[PDB]
Amino acid sequence: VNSFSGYLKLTDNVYIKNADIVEEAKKVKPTVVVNAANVYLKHGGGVAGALNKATNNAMQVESDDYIATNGPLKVGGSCVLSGHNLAKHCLHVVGPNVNKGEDIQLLKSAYENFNQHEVLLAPLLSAGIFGADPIHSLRVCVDTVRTNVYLAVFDKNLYDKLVSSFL
């Protein structure tokens, strides 16, 4: 039993809610919140810009030190950093950005990172400003993640379409 509330159950391990992931994180304070990161951990917009803003830019400061030490992530890769005031940990995961020409096949590799964590609050990888089809992202999530994932979908219209079209 966990403190996630109001989710629709899609499968044994995947749950979905129309919610602002920032507000969800502030309420639940989950062990792991997933960020929709890029390889440079530049949290300018989308989910990443919103999460960083909620940390008063502390996420960006920590991320800049991480990159200065380790260099960029791989597309499909991840790193674990602090969750600041939002969660114990933030798992920064890089899905492919279609608006950069990146291979959508890397989306499965990106979701595999979730399997290293028993429970996660997460957005749909490569959705929004990363330019992939969110219906596809949900399918890859369900077919790849085996741990317990609570998906927050900001757009109510998109949430309804994802539910109604789910196989």
Ligand X SMILES: OC1(CNc2ncnc3[nH]ccc23)CCC(F)(F)CC1
Contacts with ligand X, residue ranges (CB under 6 A)? 20-22, 46-47, 50, 123-124, 127-128, 134, 152-155, 158
* Shortest spacing between CB 19 and ligand X, in angstroms: 7
30 binds, among Cl ion, ligand X, none (CB under 5 to 8 A by kind): none
Contacts of 7 (CB under 8 A, 6+ apart): 15, 16, 17, 150
* Distance, first Cα to last Cα, the chain: 26
Alpha helices in the chain (DSSP H): 21-28, 46-54, 58-70, 106-112, 134-144, 156-164
Contacts of 74 (CB under 8 A, 6+ apart): 39, 94
153 binds, among Cl ion, ligand X, none (CB under 5 to 8 A by kind): ligand X
Q: Are 96 and 111 in contact (CB under 8 A)?
A: no
Per-residue contact string for residues 58-97; x = within reach of Cl ion by CB under 5 A = ----------------------------------------
Pull the structure tokens for residue 36: 């929709």
Q: Where the chain is broken, by preceding residue (C–N > 2.5 Å)?
A: none
Question: Site for Cl ion (CB under 5 A): which residue of 8, 28, 39, 129?
Answer: 129
* Shortest spacing between CB 138 and ligand X, in angstroms: 8
Residue among 45 and 65 whose Cβ is closer to Cl ion: 45
Question: Site for Cl ion (CB under 5 A): which residue of 30, 76, 96, 128?
Answer: 128
Q: Cα–Cα distance between 148 and 88 in angstroms, integer?
A: 16
* Shortest spacing between CB 128 and Cl ion, in angstroms: 2
Q: Which residues in this chain contact Cl ion in the complex, by CB under 5 A?
A: 46, 128-129
